Structure formats: structure tokens, C-alpha cells
Design a protein around this ligand. Structure first.
Ligand SMILES: COc1cccc(Oc2cccc(N3CCCCC3)c2CNC(=N)NC(=O)c2ccc(C[C@H](N)C(=O)O)cc2)c1
Ligand SMILES: [Fe+3]
Length: 292
């Protein structure tokens, strides 16, 4: 019995997928990253309940971060900012100062999702909702159709600030947000979501893999040199350096090819894809979505 899967028809309908969170020991066959740390586990439950209780139209709950959480943020923020000028794409560097000015991006302060959401709404019409963890590719991409980015609010475990196998709020705020503030990138991202809505399982998988190798882990060509625009790279001190080290394979971004590449979880990627620019990746995606 083949039916079209339910899809959101307006922004408030994301209330009916934001709590469909994939869990360790259930949908996800993997260990929780501070599982054996009872204190970390308790703190993670606090963050999950804030997300689960959220409903469209609520202000996003403001959190008093612990001293340890703030320190982890500061370590990540300080070391990544030493890398950005040489590693980050131009569009990323243009937007980062604005977030420092308006949203409290500082070494000693974790920006609040409510403030960042308000900033994005003014710049590109993007908004945030808090989320307890991963959603399905279909659900996550459905948010993008309404320019909603589902964001984790917890901080990665202090036992490895340089790379985490799971997204955290450092990753959302330093990896994703500065490019969500750029109109061409915001358009690019929305168009992935729009193409996903009610699509086939196969079309969703392919769109998700294209997202992974652009929004998550993309490299781009700028003035004859590779720079980084993938959010998963821009939030890892160790993978950001790796991507431009020459230790990894690179291929040209090409949706019909890129959509077949395995997305690696819990390690550095084996391969990065290089887009010429945001406009060109967007054009390539437009040509590809006609076919699926
Ligand atoms: C064991 O867990 C599993 C098992 C199976 C699949 C799985 O991946 C899923 C699951 C559901 C949806 C998705 N999407 C969502 C968006 C649309 C494309 C598909 C994905 C694909 N993953 C991601 N999009 N992202 C990451 O995995 C990621 C990014 C950054 C960091 C942080 C970074 N390393 C740092 O140190 O700062 C960590 C991880 C995870
Ligand atoms: Fe991400």
C-alpha cells in the first residue's frame, strides 16, 4: 500500500514533526557521547525536555549555561576563530562580526537561540526552533521549506572540544547560523527543503546526501583556492584543519554523483565535494530536482 507521506503545510505544522527525535538505543545504533557520565546525562535530559515542550510561537527558552559548558564554548570559539580567516569562505567571514555585535557571540558567553532566531528573521527570514536531537532527513529538510532550522541547545561533552560525533549547539551557532544569515545560502537551503516536501523516499535520500556534502561538509572554490562552507567543518577545530590539509580526497560537486556518496558518521569524511559558488550549487540543484 503506497501513500504520499504526511508533510507540513504551514510553519506551525512543524509542531507535528519536531518531537520525532531519533534516539540512541532505538533508531540510532550508537552510544550516547557522555552516556557513562551521570551528570552529563542528567543535564542532557534538561535540554531534551525544553525542546520537547516547545511549540511554534513560543519564545525559545533561555538557558543558564554551566561554567563548564561556557568554558567548552570558549575553547571552541577561541580556537575556531584563529582558523576562520584562512579556512572559512568569504560569505561566512562577512556575517560573523554581525553575530558578535547583535547576538552576544563572545568567548565568555553562549548566544541564546531566541536572540539568534530574531537576528535571522530580520536578515533572511530564517528562524530557529529548538530540537532534542536528530530528526529524520525528511523531517529536518521539511523545516527548511519554511526557513526553519531545527537547532540543538546543549553543549558537547568537555572530554573532546575539538570534534564531536553528534551535533551540539556550538555546531548550530558557529557552523550553521552565519551562513543562514546570507541571502543566497538561505535561498539554497530553502530550495532543498521545498524539493523534499512530500517527495519519494529515494528523492529525500538524494536531497539529504546533497545537503550533507554542501551545507554540512561542503568546500568551495574562491580566487583559485579551496575554502570551507560546511557547518560540520566550521564547528570542528580538528576537522576544519583536516579539510584543507590535503589529507582528504575531493571531488567536484555534481548532484547526480554526489547523491550516491556515503555520509560518514562518527569520523572525518573520506571525501569532500567542491562547489564553485553558492549560486552554482543552487543552479545545479535546480537542474537535479527536475529529475527526481
Ligand atoms: C549515529 O547517528 C547517526 C546514524 C545515522 C545517520 C546519522 O545522520 C543523520 C541522521 C538524521 C538526519 C541527518 N541529516 C540531517 C540534515 C539533512 C541531511 C541528513 C543525518 C546526517 N547527519 C548530519 N546532517 N550531520 C551530522 O551527522 C553531524 C554534523 C555535525 C557534527 C558536529 C561536528 N562533527 C563537530 O565536531 O562540530 C556531528 C554530526 C546519524
Ligand atoms: Fe548540522
Amino acid at each position: 500500500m503506497e501513500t504520499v507521506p504526511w508533510f507540513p503545510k504551514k510553519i506551525s505544522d512543524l509542531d507535528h514533526c519536531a518531537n520525532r527525535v531519533l534516539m540512541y538505543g532505538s533508531e540510532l545504533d550508537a552510544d550516547h557521547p557522555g552516556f557513562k557520565d551521570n551528570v552529563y546525562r542528567k543535564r542532557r535530559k534538561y535540554f531534551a525536555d525544553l525542546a520537547m515542550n516547545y511549540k511554534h510561537g513560543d519564545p525559545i527558552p533561555k538557558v543558564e549555561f554551566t561554567e563548564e559548558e561556557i568554558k567548552t564554548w570558549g575553547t571552541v570559539f577561541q580556537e575556531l576563530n584563529k582558523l576562520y580567516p584562512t579556512h572559512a569562505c568569504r560569505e561566512y567571514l562577512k556575517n560573523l562580526p554581525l553575530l558578535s555585535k547583535y547576538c552576544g557571540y563572545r568567548e565568555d558567553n553562549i548566544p541564546q537561540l531566541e536572540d539568534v532566531s530574531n537576528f535571522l528573521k530580520e536578515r533572511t527570514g530564517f528562524s530557529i526552533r529548538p530540537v532534542a536531537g536528530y530528526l529524520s532527513p525528511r523531517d529536518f529538510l521539511s523545516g527548511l521549506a519554511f526557513r526553519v532550522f531545527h537547532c540543538t541547545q546543549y553543549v558537547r561533552h568537555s572530554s573532546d572540544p575539538f570534534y564531536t560525533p553528534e551535533p551540539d549547539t556550538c555546531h548550530e551557532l558557529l557552523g550553521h547560523v552565519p551562513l543562514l544569515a546570507e541571502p543566497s545560502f538561505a535561498q539554497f537551503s530553502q530550495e532543498i527543503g521545498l524539493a523534499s516536501l512530500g517527495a519519494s523516499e529515494e528523492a529525500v535520500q538524494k536531497l539529504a546526501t546533497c545537503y550533507f556534502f554542501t551545507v554540512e561538509f561542503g568546500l568551495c572554490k574562491q580566487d583559485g583556492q579551496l575554502r570551507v562552507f560546511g557547518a560540520g567543518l566550521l564547528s570542528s577545530i580538528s576537522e576544519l584543519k583536516h579539510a584543507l590539509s590535503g589529507h582528504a580526497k575531493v571531488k567536484p560537486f555534481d548532484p547526480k554523483i554526489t547523491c550516491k556518496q556515503e555520509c560518514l558518521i562518527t569520523t572525518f569524511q573520506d571525501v569532500y565535494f567542491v562547489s564553485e559558488s553558492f549560486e552554482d550549487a543552487k543552479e545545479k540543484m535546480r537542474e537535479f530536482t527536475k529529475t527526481i
